[PDB]
Design a protein around this ligand. Structure first.
Ligand SMILES: [Mg+2]
Lengths: 288, 442, 251
């Protein structure tokens, strides 16, 4: 039985936010983070946002994360405007004198007219990645992988690519799960696909892997990094740092290159019927 | 009701084995060599660091034992904070930590965060309602320790902190608690009185302990009222939180010659702050974070050239609103110095503005110029920016080696900007692909 | 069940969406630069418009402040290389030279509708959910952004819609990896729709779909293939066909 599933991510534009955005400047990461795929899988199964923290997030957070870079993106920026021609909601409320009544007791007296509105224009610039491909291969229990694959076969809710306007252009359920011992062999098992015949191909394909703790002890290596994308809660969000390493894989020795398997250009039909073909002479004779 | 930092757990750290946790100040002083400080925001990671820096400075002041590198911290540091247990308290009717006498200017505990909106701020990316949601004691401690270093102006009658505008904050990074503690140990003959001691006085015109822990504001921090949801800062499900308090503004007297070792000052003695915004105006073009500003400066006044990881913290502001804060890490060893090339590297954004602003043909006043180049600036900038520590010392990567990175994207642009099929079309594309940024020293 | 709408439209020289420097919005695709109209433009373009205003509607469809909106709009993308231009204009005194700029492109759009979330947000109402779906169809087929339309009167009308009821959300943006070159014996719209045809002819070889074209102008597929289930000649008839495939539903 297969023990690890495979997810394919591709779109015209994608973004995966980092820790370096606590204001209207939203920057993106180079690779799809763990929290993004966890959220997409929660959407595909159809778990509530208040329920993910109750025996549903750590169960999949125990899995091992593995990403392969088929082709990386061009860093792109889009200028965003909020509230053009309207009045926005502001956060101040009047001081309720005695500090004994606060919080939920104060929220019971809240009215729609108690809020105040301000007409302004909120400007932001959001970063997107253009023409990027990724594979997510999660190693877990064979039953858990079977449940995950069945859930992503038909998602309960709609799915997006980090932000709700980034559509899928290849099937996420394209790859059937398999049984492999290591994440490296699993990431090397799924082949590399070409779109059209003549294009640049990356000779090196970077991979992102979780750092195995090994035996009891075994302090973290000097080349490992930190990443704050282990979600504990989603409403309101709670995130946890993690250890991340980097490995590379050279093409042509452990990942093959698949063929084009299709046609790119469309082109009109064939005019110029041949007058020396036998069918032409037969039809001409019958018409005569 | 009763809260003490030495005993209660607030320090969000991550062990080197891979397990994050929240342990106390005493426990962080106890282990101190198998962990890293775990704080996603740069502000908290800098403030907890500076509080440990001040603690180690006071422990050396009253114990006179240095922390040896590649060793556990001295054991005699622990009992001195146990003896002075009354000076670290978060509540109670008496001596308080980062607090003073209460007042009547009642404000909720949300202004102590630069990222959680309050008052007239826009709560569009974080829906927060006043006197509804509050913070926990660990979050209260974290918001308390950020007043000394990120205090900007607050309008009419309210000033900034002791450093006026908070500049760049550059320091040296290492992979364990003793590692970074042991890279920034340089003491002074004058220490001062830190804020956790008795009632601080300006007295005459500072030092080391009193220099870092300046109090531009006083805080009340009433007892946690039984309001319940979970949290909003770190999202943790918790217990009764504090919701309302007091803040009064303490002006800084004139004079007070003080030099922050991590702070970066300009030629005139003004602060050197970040160069980022959300808009590409007539005098700015949006490229990336500005890691090139505090370089033809760190390399001559304070810090000099030394082997390690130079961590850059860039905190932007304008009036009373923060816009963007970022971090970065660069590798150096000290491979000589060319003062002219470092100067050109300190002045790069004007070169990018001049490259963007060039007209396609002819010349016109108030001409914006080639806005697709403004779209492709960030990609080549981020492809260049990986070897910032190699461009700084000029080991193998040069201005001309950095110049070649623009060619692919720019040849992609030239097809769109001249989508014709003439000899003149390809010749204009060839002239267009020879556009390179030019260095400007002053 | 997800109802997915495929959308090809041509547009006259104009500038509907611009950035801070004013440039026509542009993404990167297929090794070159692509003309771009934001999805957050089509939202607040279709939304708050007069034609669309025909349990409360316009809240279950598109949200405002855990609303869980059931409509998803993607970024429109050109089917050829972006070709921007800059216009030179002068001012009179009737008693200095500036620059304005514009772009012209044919865009592919993509619309997706979650039926189950729409029914759940209607408190069990079903005729209202299909009513709102139809209303969004008639709005989206006849809505443009209100950009620089006084000077560039860009009021073009579409040239083909294909509607899908597939199991999982999937776009056809990968059909336009190769930029479209115009040949003498065709045009831009015909070659774009043919490139859309030789990507739905695949996949199944390697679901159903209703198709409409106005008075059957540019028929889908350049053979007699059954790549679309039915080819229809009216917008109302296509909407009625969508409602009919949802169930017994009259318009
Ligand atoms: Mg908190």
């Amino acid at each position: 039985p297969p023990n690890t599933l495979f997810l394919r991510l591709e779109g015209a534009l994608q973004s995966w936010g980092s820790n370096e955005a606590k204001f209207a400047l939203r920057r993106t990461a180079d690779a799809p983070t763990k929290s993004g795929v966890l959220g997409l899988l929660c959407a595909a199964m159809g778990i509530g946002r208040a329920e993910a923290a109750d025996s549903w997030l750590p169960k999949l957070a125990n899995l091992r994360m593995g990403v392969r870079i088929d082709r990386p993106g061009i860093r792109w920026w889009d200028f965003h405007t909020v509230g053009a021609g309207q009045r926005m909601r502001m956060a101040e409320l009047k001081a309720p004198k005695k500090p004994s009544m606060v919080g939920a007791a104060l929220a019971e007296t809240l009215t729609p007219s108690k809020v105040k509105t301000r007409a302004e224009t909120l400007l932001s610039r959001r970063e997107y990645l253009a023409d990027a491909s990724f594979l997510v291969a999660l190693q877990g229990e064979p039953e858990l992988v079977a449940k995950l694959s069945a859930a992503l076969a038909k998602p309960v809710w709609a799915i997006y690519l980090g932000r709700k306007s980034c559509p899928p252009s290849r099937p996420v359920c394209e790859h059937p799960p398999g049984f492999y011992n290591t994440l490296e062999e699993a990431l090397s098992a799924v082949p590399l696909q070409k779109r059209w015949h003549n294009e640049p191909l990356p000779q090196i394909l970077p991979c992102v892997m979780d750092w195995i703790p090994g035996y009891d002890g075994e302090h973290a290596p000097d080349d490992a990094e930190i990443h704050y994308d282990l979600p504990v809660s989603f409403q309101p969000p709670r995130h946890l740092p993690r250890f991340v390493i980097r490995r590379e894989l050279v093409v042509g020795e452990d990942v093959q290159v698949s063929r084009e398997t299709g046609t790119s250009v469309w082109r009109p039909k064939g005019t110029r019927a041949d007058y020396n073909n036998s069918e032409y002479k037969k039809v001409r004779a019958e018409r005569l | 009701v009763m809260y003490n930092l030495l005993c209660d757990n607030w320090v969000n750290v991550v062990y080197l084995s891979g397990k994050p946790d929240r342990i106390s100040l005493v426990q962080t002083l106890k282990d101190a060599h198998c962990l890293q400080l775990a704080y996603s925001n740069p502000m908290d990671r800098f403030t907890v660091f500076r509080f440990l820096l001040a603690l180690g400075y006071w422990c050396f002041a009253n114990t006179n034992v240095e922390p040896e590198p590649d060793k556990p911290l001295p054991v005699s540091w622990i009992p001195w904070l146990e003896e002075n247990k009354e000076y670290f308290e978060l509540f109670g009717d008496g001596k308080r930590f980062f607090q003073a006498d209460p007042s009547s200017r009642i404000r909720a505990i949300t202004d102590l965060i630069h990222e959680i909106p309050t008052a007239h701020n826009l709560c569009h990316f974080k829906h927060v309602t006043d006197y509804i949601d509050g913070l926990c004691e660990a979050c209260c401690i974290k918001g308390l320790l950020r007043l000394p270093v990120f205090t900007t102006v607050g309008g009419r009658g309210i000033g900034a902190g002791i450093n006026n505008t908070p500049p760049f904050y550059l320091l040296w990074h290492a992979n364990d608690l003793a590692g970074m503690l042991a890279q920034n140990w340089q003491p002074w003959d004058n220490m001062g009185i830190p804020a956790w001691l008795g009632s601080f006085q300006k007295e005459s015109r500072v030092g080391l302990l009193a220099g870092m822990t300046w109090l531009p504001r006083k805080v009340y921090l009433h007892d946690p009222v039984p309001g319940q949801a979970a949290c909003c800062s770190c999202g943790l499900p918790s217990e009764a939180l504090v919701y309302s308090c007091s803040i009064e503004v303490e002006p800084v007297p004139k004079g007070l010659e003080w030099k922050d070792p991590h702070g970066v000052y300009t030629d005139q003695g003004k602060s050197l702050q970040s160069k980022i915004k959300l808009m590409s105006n007539d005098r700015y073009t949006f490229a990336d974070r500005d890691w090139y500003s505090p370089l033809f400066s760190y390399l001559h006044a304070e810090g000099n050239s030394r082997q390690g990881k130079l961590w850059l913290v860039g905190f932007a502001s304008d009036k009373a609103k923060s816009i963007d804060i970022w971090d970065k890490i660069i590798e150096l060893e000290g491979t000589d110095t060319n003062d002219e090339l470092l100067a050109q590297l300190a002045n790069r954004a004007t070169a990018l503005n001049a490259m963007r602003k060039k007209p396609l043909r002819g010349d016109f006043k108030k001409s914006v110029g080639t806005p697709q180049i403004a779209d492709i600036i960030p990609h080549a900038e981020n492809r260049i920016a990986i070897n910032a520590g190699k461009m700084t010392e000029n080991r193998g990567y040069s201005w001309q080696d950095a110049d070649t990175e623009y060619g692919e994207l720019l040849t992609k642009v030239a097809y769109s900007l001249e989508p014709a099929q003439t000899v003149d079309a390809r010749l204009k594309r060839g002239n267009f692909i020879s556009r390179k940024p030019w260095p400007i020293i002053p | 069940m997800l109802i997915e709408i495929h959308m090809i439209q041509n547009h006259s020289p104009a500038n509907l969406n611009r950035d801070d420097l004013g440039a026509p919005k542009t993404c990167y695709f297929g090794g070159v630069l692509r003309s771009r109209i934001s999805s957050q433009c089509i939202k607040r373009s279709i939304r708050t418009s007069n034609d669309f205003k025909a349990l409360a509607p316009d809240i279950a469809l598109c949200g405002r402040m855990t609303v869980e909106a059931a409509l998803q709009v993607a970024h429109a993308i050109s089917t050829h290389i972006a070709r921007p231009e800059i216009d030179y204009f002068v001012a009179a005194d009737d008693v200095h030279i500036g620059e304005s700029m514009f772009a012209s492109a044919c865009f592919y759009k993509y619309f997706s509708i979650d039926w189950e979330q729409l029914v759940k947000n209607l408190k069990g109402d079903t005729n209202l959910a299909a009513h709102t779906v139809g209303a969004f169809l008639l709005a989206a087929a006849k809505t443009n952004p209100s950009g620089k339309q006084n000077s560039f009167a860009a009021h073009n009308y579409p040239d083909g819609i294909l509607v899908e009821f597939k199991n999982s959300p999937i776009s056809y943006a990968n059909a336009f990896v190769r930029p479209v070159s115009v040949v003498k014996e065709s045009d831009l719209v015909e070659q774009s729709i043919g490139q859309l045809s030789n990507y739905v002819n695949d996949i199944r070889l390697g679901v159903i779909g209703f198709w409409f074209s106005p008075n059957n102008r540019y028929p889908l597929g350049y053979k007699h293939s059954k790549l679309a289930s039915r080819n229809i000649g009216n917008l109302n008839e296509l909407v009625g066909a969508v409602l009919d495939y949802i169930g017994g539903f009259k318009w």
